Amino acid sequence: VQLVESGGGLVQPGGSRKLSCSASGFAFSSFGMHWVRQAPEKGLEWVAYISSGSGTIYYADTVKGRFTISRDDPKNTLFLQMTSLRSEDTAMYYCVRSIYYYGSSPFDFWGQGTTLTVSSSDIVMTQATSSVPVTPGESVSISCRSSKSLLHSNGNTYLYWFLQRPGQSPQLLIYRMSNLASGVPDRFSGSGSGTAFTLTISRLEAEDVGVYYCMQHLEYPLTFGAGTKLEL
Amino acid sequence: GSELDQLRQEAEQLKNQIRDARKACADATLSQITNNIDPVGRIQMRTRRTLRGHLAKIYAMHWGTDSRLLVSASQDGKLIIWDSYTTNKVHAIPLRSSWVMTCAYAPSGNYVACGGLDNICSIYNLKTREGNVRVSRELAGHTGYLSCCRFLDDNQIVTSSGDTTCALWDIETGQQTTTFTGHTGDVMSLSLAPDTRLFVSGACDASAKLWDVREGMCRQTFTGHESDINAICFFPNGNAFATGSDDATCRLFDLRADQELMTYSHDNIICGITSVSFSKSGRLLLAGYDDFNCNVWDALKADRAGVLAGHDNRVSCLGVTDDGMAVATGSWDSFLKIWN
Amino acid sequence: FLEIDKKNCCVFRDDFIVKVLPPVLGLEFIFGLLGNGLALWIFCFHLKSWKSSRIFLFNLAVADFLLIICLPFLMDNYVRRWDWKFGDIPCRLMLFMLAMNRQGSIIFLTVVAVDRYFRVVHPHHALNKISNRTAAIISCLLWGITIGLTVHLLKKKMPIQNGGANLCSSFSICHTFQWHEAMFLLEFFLPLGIILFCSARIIWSLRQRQMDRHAKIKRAITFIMVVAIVFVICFLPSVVVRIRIFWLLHTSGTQNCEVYRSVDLAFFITLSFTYMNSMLDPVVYYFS
Amino acid sequence: TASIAQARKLVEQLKMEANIDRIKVSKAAADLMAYCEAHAKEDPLLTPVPASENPFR
Amino acid sequence: GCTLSAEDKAAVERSKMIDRNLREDGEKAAREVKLLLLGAGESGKNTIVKQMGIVETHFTFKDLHFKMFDVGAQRSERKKWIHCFEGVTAIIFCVALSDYDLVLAEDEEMNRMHASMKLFDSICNNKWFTDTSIILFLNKKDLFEEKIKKSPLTICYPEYAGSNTYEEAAAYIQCQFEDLNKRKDTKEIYTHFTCSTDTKNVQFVFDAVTDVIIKNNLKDCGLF
Ligand SMILES: CC(C)CCC[C@@H](C)[C@H]1CC[C@H]2[C@@H]3CC=C4C[C@@H](O)CC[C@]4(C)[C@H]3CC[C@]12C
Ligand SMILES: O=C(O)c1cccnc1
């Protein structure tokens, strides 16, 4: 089980590029695949989505028309192809697998990341704070907020809390605002209602420090709040 | 020799003593006690969903723990997991031996069990990290076809086979940790207690037995049918269980007082039962017949209260959710039906 | 008797049609109607097989039935000797239904006789195992070509001045080659050269296999011959009178219509054979 | 002479099953009635369920 | 589409892929031939198997795949699992005819010919095999022509009178088998003579199944 992606580098403004990933260790043909760009200037957002069966393909309005996505299902490979690269197309790219059936936990394994540098309506989610100083051993809380209700017809609040430790790739913490991913300690939790939610941590350790993010999935494009760093 | 004959005579007079003990502890029929109450109205249940995609006879189904998923098995060599609310398909699992007779769902949601007409019970892991279902363990050692299986825990299972033997198994080691013997003919079914401390089995010698998980203790023997016995279930309380035979009859047996409680027979039915199941309050008994349709019995008066007439062929399997929401029904036409 | 529709076309009105044609046509209506009606009722209400061989007969049991409803108005046309009083549209929809059902009761009568051949000489073949969702498509295509070869009978100002009355018809004795007569001959020649071949090979190959010793094989053989010879009897006569007509047109000019005086009368009797099948089509396929 | 051993097994099984105490049938029937009466409200099949909150409609 | 959410519009597509796979895979099971093999103990079942819980067997003859099910090791009730073979093309039934005086290890008096005759009778009138054809194999004819000359078959056939030669005795035994049928219009029993021949067995089976298939197709379209 691993997603090894390559294709990054430094590019001209006018010019194409390709980003491939190899998914070794699982049944790749049963996984819808996302690209999530991460601008170095605290930039985060969803890029593109291709499903299991090459039926659906989705883009975020800022990208539609210049990126194309594809699969190589016999050889377990995922491709992105980019044609027009503006000056604000410099960031890092995370390929995320996710499988949708009842009870699943999408956005589970998050790849490693590939850096791309360029030569020189939508729901809104808000994380007003940016930094919370605190000492280990005591509880902490972070807030995120949207602009409308998320209790959809299927009753599921499509908010995803997930973490990035310094120098590491992210990992899922809380999918659907009330469910904790697998492999992470049970110290993390989260609760909210309406348009406002809070991630909570009861016991504080040295690994728990990092930058936290919130995701909505109700409809494409997928939109975030900002980052709220915890500091030692 | 003479010892054989004297032991046989002693056994016969013990049988007479046990028969007299069973007879002498009964005072009134369960119908007399249950006749004061009023009967439920005409239970009108309509087909809400219709699960289709099986291409051959369906032999078993089992309701999931959260009362939204279920699994089914057919002679096509496939096992299928459903979403009852949406009518989606969550998983399709290919089998090795096309000749199946039962399937089972783990009470946590990680595993499903299968096997039949091959003397091997296979275990499947659903929540793997590779995304696909895989074979966990292959319990082998029986010498007759497997007729039922039911998870006791996440690591203990119990099966009954056609070689007149039940067995309690560990999935980790793979070796029988208990063997239950004492039946003469093929064993057709078993059902687990609510608290997983006892379980009952029913066999082709027109007899059923109450076992004991911890040590192997055969605690009690029930009779009464004059043909095979291919369906049993505990009452939700855990103090009773009902049987469905091949001579177009269903019966109710009590654990504490070991006699007959209820006979569910009707002259216009001349063909035998395939499946039985209960309701959340233990008020409805659903019986799957082979006159092509199911039947709903008021389990306290024995009279009918509804018919699920919707199938083209014989009914094999049948189940009820844990919350009491719906009832699911399979048959030999390869169509599952959810009723509310 | 010579008039001009758009061409030099003879036309007659003989006082012998009235005596014989209305009774023939009324009997063929009143029995063909029920004969196809209960067949279609069974196919729709009291039969639950629905195999890729019972949805080729269903189409043949709607084609002929449509021809029936069209009959009483033709009986009214003959009872008053070529006097049409219902205007333009009823005439122009009475001569497209008849001409499109008949070609569509012969296209769904050949497919059966190919079904059977692929079920005898070529057992366990692919076309024996097609689903009844890939046979309704070909039924729709067959209806499509049927309708596409008969549309030219709505695009014409049909009722015509004969002086005395108005004649509602498609079969008139002219001297110009066209598509309708060629269709009339070619809707009989090709299905014959297919049915004979299929119905002979089925019987022969069910006989060089020494298999014709159970009764039901013999019964099937008899009914196969029944089908072929009933087709030839109920269709052939009309296709030789029209050849005699073309013979007379090419040999003798259309200047003395009196020559045709008798033969055409015979034609409008032999054409009453073409409806004949729609009466006794079910008694061969759907009942016995 | 294993036949007498099998007879010994069977008679031991009879000794083994002849050592239990029983109750009256009417008491079991009353317990069944009581359990049915207590849970009459939580089962969406016996009492005609309102069409407001079921998730299969 | 509109009423659904972005995480209930991939569940539907996944279910559709499941359905497509199920349908495409259920077409390779309605074109194969299924044959159920039976015999009476040491009746040469292994012999015919070599001539070509459950024991599957695979072979292909003339671009046509057969699946032979051998259920000899069940040693349990037959009525509890026989109906699982209801939709089978044919039943192969193998028996050795050189074994009329050789009696079973169970009873000295009863021989194995009578036991196998009872078996063939019992398989020929079950309610699940009303229209199911039976292919009959008579075995060890080599040893039989020697055995019959030493001792008459009157021992096994008290009501029989024959000159104790090969052909008449073999034909009498064959008649005694084929008279056991009780349907005679829907069903047909196909019989054959082989000891160790390498060509006649599989061709016999192929002919017997082509005849059944022809009948099935012709009665499917009403004509038959
Ligand atoms: C079972 C499946 C394969 C049946 C296929 C039927 C095909 C092979 C045959 C059956 C009868 C045939 C038709 C017989 C006669 C006519 C009328 C003629 O004016 C045009 C061709 C047309 C319309 C033929 C087209 C081909 C046809 C439709
Ligand atoms: O069959 C016809 O189309 C027809 C019938 C009567 C007169 N003219 C044509």
Side-chain angles (χ1 to χ4, degrees), chain C residues 50-56 115 119 127 130-132 134-135:
Chain C
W50 282 134
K51 185 64 64 67
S52 173
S53 196
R54 213 77 63 168
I55 76 174
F56 281 146
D115 194 32
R119 284 177 179 253
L127 291 93
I130 60 180
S131 58
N132 63 7
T134 187

Side-chain angles (χ1 to χ4, degrees), chain B residues 91-108:
Chain B
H91 288 119
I93 312 164
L95 293 172
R96 215 183 59 161
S97 183
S98 169
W99 319 99
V100 290
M101 299 211 159
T102 50
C103 66
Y105 207 92
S108 83

Side-chain angles (χ1 to χ4, degrees), chain C residues 130-150:
Chain C
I130 60 180
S131 58
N132 63 7
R133 185 211 152 284
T134 187
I137 297 169
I138 203 79
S139 294
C140 292
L141 188 148
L142 292 177
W143 275 118
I145 185 169
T146 313
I147 291 175
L149 294 172
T150 306

Side-chain angles (χ1 to χ4, degrees), chain C residues 67 74 77-78 82 94-100 102 153 168-172 180 184 267-268 271 274-275:
Chain C
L67 205 83
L74 191 57
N77 184 359
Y78 283 151
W82 316 121
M94 185 166 128
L95 314 187
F96 161 90
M97 292 296 268
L98 289 181
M100 181 223 77
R102 163 194 307 142
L153 295 165
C168 180
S169 298
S170 164
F171 285 136
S172 294
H180 189 64
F184 188 58
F267 176 73
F268 281 110
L271 192 64
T274 303
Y275 317 142

Side-chain angles (χ1 to χ4, degrees), chain A residues 52 55-56 99-100 152 154 158 160 176 217-218 220, chain E residues 2-11 13-14 17:
Chain A
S52 72
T56 78
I99 180 172
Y100 312 95
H152 187 302
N154 52 58
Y158 293 164
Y160 310 125
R176 267 64 166 280
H217 213 282
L218 277 296
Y220 298 74
Chain E
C2 303
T3 318
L4 302 182
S5 178
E7 310 189 0
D8 204 308
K9 292 188 262 220
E13 182 157 3
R14 178 190 179 81
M17 301 219 62

